[PDB]
Amino acid sequence: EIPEVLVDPRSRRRYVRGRFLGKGGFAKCFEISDADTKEVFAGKIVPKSLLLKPHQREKMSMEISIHRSLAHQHVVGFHGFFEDNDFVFVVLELCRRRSLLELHKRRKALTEPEARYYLRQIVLGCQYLHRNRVIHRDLKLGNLFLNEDLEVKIGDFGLATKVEYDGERKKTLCGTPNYIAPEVLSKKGHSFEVDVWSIGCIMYTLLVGKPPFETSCLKETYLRIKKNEYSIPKHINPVAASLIQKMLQTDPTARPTINELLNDEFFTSGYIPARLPITCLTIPPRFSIA
Amino acid sequence: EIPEVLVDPRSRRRYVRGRFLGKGGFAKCFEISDADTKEVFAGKIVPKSLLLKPHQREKMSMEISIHRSLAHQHVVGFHGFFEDNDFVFVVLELCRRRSLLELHKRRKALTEPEARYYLRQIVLGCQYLHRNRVIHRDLKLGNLFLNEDLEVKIGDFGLATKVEYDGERKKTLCGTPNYIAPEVLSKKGHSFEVDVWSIGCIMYTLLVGKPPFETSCLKETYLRIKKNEYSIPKHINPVAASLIQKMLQTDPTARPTINELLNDEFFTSGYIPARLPITCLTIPPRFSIA
Numbered sequence: 119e120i121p122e123v124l125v126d127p128r129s130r131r132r133y134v135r136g137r138f139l140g141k142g143g144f145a146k147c148f149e150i151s152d153a154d155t156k157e158v159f160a161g162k163i164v165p166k167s168l169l170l171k172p173h174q175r176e177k178m179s180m181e182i183s184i185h186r187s188l189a190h191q192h193v194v195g196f197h198g199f200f201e202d203n204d205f206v207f208v209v210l211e212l213c214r215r216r217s218l219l220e221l222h223k224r225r226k227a228l229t230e231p232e233a234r235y236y237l238r239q240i241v242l243g244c245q246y247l248h249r250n251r252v253i254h255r256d257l258k259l260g261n262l263f264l265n266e267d268l269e270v271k272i273g274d275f276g277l278a279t280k281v282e283y284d285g286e287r288k289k290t291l292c293g294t295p296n297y298i299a300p301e302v303l304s305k306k307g308h309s310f311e312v313d314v315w316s317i318g319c320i321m322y323t324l325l326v327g328k329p330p331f332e333t334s335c336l337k338e339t340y341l342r343i344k345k346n347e348y349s350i351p352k353h354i355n356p357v358a359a360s361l362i363q364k365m366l367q368t369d370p371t372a373r374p375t376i377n378e379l380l381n382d383e384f385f386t387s388g389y390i391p392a393r394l395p396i397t398c399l400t401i402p403p404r405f406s407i408a
Numbered sequence: 409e410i411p412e413v414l415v416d417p418r419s420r421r422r423y424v425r426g427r428f429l430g431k432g433g434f435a436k437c438f439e440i441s442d443a444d445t446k447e448v449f450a451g452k453i454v455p456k457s458l459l460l461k462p463h464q465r466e467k468m469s470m471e472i473s474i475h476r477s478l479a480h481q482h483v484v485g486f487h488g489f490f491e492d493n494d495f496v497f498v499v500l501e502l503c504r505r506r507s508l509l510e511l512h513k514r515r516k517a518l519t520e521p522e523a524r525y526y527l528r529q530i531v532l533g534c535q536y537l538h539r540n541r542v543i544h545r546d547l548k549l550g551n552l553f554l555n556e557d558l559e560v561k562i563g564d565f566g567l568a569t570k571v572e573y574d575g576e577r578k579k580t581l582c583g584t585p586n587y588i589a590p591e592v593l594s595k596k597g598h599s600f601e602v603d604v605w606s607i608g609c610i611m612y613t614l615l616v617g618k619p620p621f622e623t624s625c626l627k628e629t630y631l632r633i634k635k636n637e638y639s640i641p642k643h644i645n646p647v648a649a650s651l652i653q654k655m656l657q658t659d660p661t662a663r664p665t666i667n668e669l670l671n672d673e674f675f676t677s678g679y680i681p682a683r684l685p686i687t688c689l690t691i692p693p694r695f696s697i698a
């Protein structure tokens with residue numbers, strides 16, 4: 119039923135529906151191109167048949183509200199939204215090189231200078247989110263998207279929440295995040311630190327080549343998270359291992375804040391490439407001097 | 409792809425696939441009749457394409473293991489299982505009058521003598537489960553099935569667990585039960601009392617005409633459960649209200665045990681019909697003297 123050609127009344131714009139990208143929760147994403155300027159975008163498309171209950175509607179509406187007000191080099195740009203009688207359409211910045219998840223499935227453990235590259239941009243985008251009082255709450259490999267230059271763009275605000283006043287503890291999270299912080303599981307009240315915890319797990323995954331708390335049962339995984347039950351393999355450099363630990367702590371007060379992170383010895387005393395080549399999508403880069 | 413005719417090698421038996429009954433988790437259920445004796449059954453059918461990961465397989469296998477060893481008037485009888493290359497087939501006692509859920513959607517609040525009728529048989533089946541060291545963990549309206557005589561049959565052992573030694577606390581529940589006990593949410597360790605809590609909520613629903621902890625967000629609901637945040641409308645007889653409360657308590661040590669329940673004043677000092685007519689599926693029964 120999804121129409122071949124997405125029409126916005128009000129802006130007059132038409133978009134040809136194109137290549138399927140990926141799917142998740144209520145949504146499906148396609149490559150879409152503006153029929154006029156020919157400019158290309160990603161279209162997030164939610165069927166209204168799945169948004170019959172007000173609570174689901176309010177989630178969709180919250181996603182757009184939060185995403186709508188955000189512009190930054192390392193967050194998937196918002197270029198508009200509109201609806202017809204059957205679907206909601208969200209027009210986003212296309213990231214032609216998919217996400218970190220697909221990079222991770224191909225390359226496993228990344229070289230240390232790569233992790234610094236990506237981690238930095240992840241932190242940068244998240245620094246922007248936090249100073250604008252936004253909590254992502256689902257940072258994971260598949261939500262961190264890569265444009266043609268391999269620049270990271272934080273995406274998917276479907277679990278995001280706006281902090282409303284100082285010291286606010288959000289007490290519910292309605293969704294199931296991948297790298298979910300211990301204080302969400304125990305329902306102890308949560309805020310910005312959930313994102314640092316997640317960047318903890320992303321750092322672990324990028325360097326180690328697998329998630330820190332994987333088992334065959336989500337609930338066993340959850341048990342592990344609560345009891346800080348992980349371990350870093352011995353080959354990981356102590357400085358890296360040390361940043362991972364700082365971030366992966368049970369007590370949210372004790373983790374660095376998003377602004378403390380780029381100042382960490384992991385970044386300041388290691389090499390951080392200015393840019394990565396396309397080869398590095400499939401070949402471990404050596405970073406040779408010539 | 410589900411075959412029209414289910415063949416067990418080993419027992420030689422064939423079953424014609426018939427009317428669709430309902431669906432849930434990995435399974436679909438149909439009316440099936442033995443091609444030979446013509447006897448009629450319910451067939452629970454799980455596609456192997458959904459059981460690729462060992463963890464899902466072990467759940468299916470656990471369901472059959474637990475259900476297999478159970479025979480009682482008020483638990484859906486197990487009549488066998490078998491598989492081909494694409495499906496698992498479980499052959500169960502057909503309950504022609506669906507479940508309490510469909511009764512509840514039609515009649516809302518039940519008359520007090522009806523609730524006693526149903527609650528008693530629910531408790532009886534569960535008394536059998538508990539003395540055989542089985543915990544259902546998902547007792548709800550849609551799992552309590554009615555045969556042609558309106559007799560209750562506890563069904564769906566997909567979240568059931570065998571208690572293995574005295575004082576064992578099960579620490580994970582991998583599934584999302586409807587009327588989930590507070591000590592499962594807080595991950596405090598859980599055992600048999602989870603079922604009494606559930607019968608608490610079933611009693612509430614049968615008498616009040618809606619669930620005790622309903623909101624528009626499952627997580628808000630969860631918050632309510634943990635904080636014992638419910639209330640009984642004022643028209644509910646104090647003796648009933650009193651049994652509901654005894655069972656709906658945050659502290660699992662403090663709830664009656666399944667064996668304490670039929671001894672409760674709610675049952676012993678009220679009228680309990682020996683049987684209910686089919687009319688009572690759609691008409692409130694007055695229980696007139698002639």
Ligand SMILES: COc1ccc(N2CCN(C)CC2)cc1Nc1ncc2c(n1)-c1c(c(C(N)=O)nn1C)CC2
Pocket residue numbers: 139140141142147160162194210211212213214215216217219260261263273274275
């Ligand atoms: C060629 O362009 C792409 C190809 C593959 C992928 N995926 C990345 C994540 N993955 C799990 C599936 C593939 C992404 C892009 N580009 C791409 N560009 C922009 C967006 C998306 N994908 C996208 C969005 C979401 C969301 N949850 O809001 N899901 N996808 C898929 C954010 C907007």
Ligand SMILES: COc1ccc(N2CCN(C)CC2)cc1Nc1ncc2c(n1)-c1c(c(C(N)=O)nn1C)CC2
Pocket residue numbers: 429430431432437450452484500501502503504505506507509550551553563564565
């Ligand atoms: C005519 O026979 C029936 C018609 C409707 C229903 N349903 C009751 C629950 N509901 C939510 C859907 C309809 C049930 C029956 N009879 C019926 N009889 C026996 C069984 C089932 N249904 C059945 C089983 C399960 C399970 N989870 O293991 N799901 N269903 C559906 C247990 C075996």
Ligand SMILES: [Zn+2]
Pocket residue numbers: 334335336337463582
């Ligand atoms: Zn599990």
Ligand SMILES: [Zn+2]
Pocket residue numbers: 173292624625626627
């Ligand atoms: Zn919700």
